[PDB]
């Protein structure tokens, strides 16, 4: 689901567990203490392992980075040092040029274009 998550060898039918001093059910109400009496091996692929979904290291290649040519919140999701998913967050410099040009003449709208690319 959202917060946590939960074969080759034959499924082997074994029933009628017995010891030398009785049956499995005779000492069932006492064997939880006995760690050597458990019937759920930990190598089984179907063994119930319930582990929380701890999110991966998501460094922010954020606005305050010299590599950034502006203000870019580059949300990088990385495991180890490889790159899994990248979601750039543009808009930290949305001055709304397209909205302002609609209210200014064709001569007055020219200086807006020099401010698109600084170079």
């Amino acid at each position: 689901n959202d917060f946590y998550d939960v074969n080759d060898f034959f499924p082997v039918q074994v029933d009628g567990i017995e010891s030398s001093l009785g049956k499995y059910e005779e000492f069932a109400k006492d064997a939880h203490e006995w760690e050597s009496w458990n019937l759920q091996n930990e190598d089984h692929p179907e063994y119930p392992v319930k582990r929380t979904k701890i999110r991966h290291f998501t460094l922010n290649f954020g606005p305050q980075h010299p590599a950034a040519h502006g203000v870019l919140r580059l949300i990088l999701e990385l495991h180890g040092e490889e790159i899994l998913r990248s979601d750039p967050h543009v808009g930290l410099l949305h001055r709304g040029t397209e909205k302002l040009i609609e209210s200014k003449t064709y001569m007055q709208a020219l200086p807006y274009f020099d401010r698109l690319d600084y170079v």
Binding site: L21, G22, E33, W34, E35, S36, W37
Partner: protein
């Protein structure tokens, strides 16, 4: 069917079940558990060997 069964298969099944119940608790994966017994056994070297019978008496007491 009386004392010779208490001093026999029926009586010895109780004693074996009692002792084997205590033992099966000891076998459990724990580094701290196995560490103390190793350190505890170092007391055998320290004690004068005239005191082995007392440790044997004490060890039986802890079984209970």
């Amino acid at each position: 069917r009386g004392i010779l069964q208490l001093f026999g298969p029926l009586g010895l099944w109780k004693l074996s079940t009692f002792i084997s119940s205590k033992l099966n608790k000891l076998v459990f994966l724990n580094i701290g558990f196995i560490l103390e017994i190793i350190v505890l056994s170092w007391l055998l070297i320290v004690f004068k060997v005239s005191l082995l019978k007392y440790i044997l008496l004490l060890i039986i007491f802890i079984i209970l």
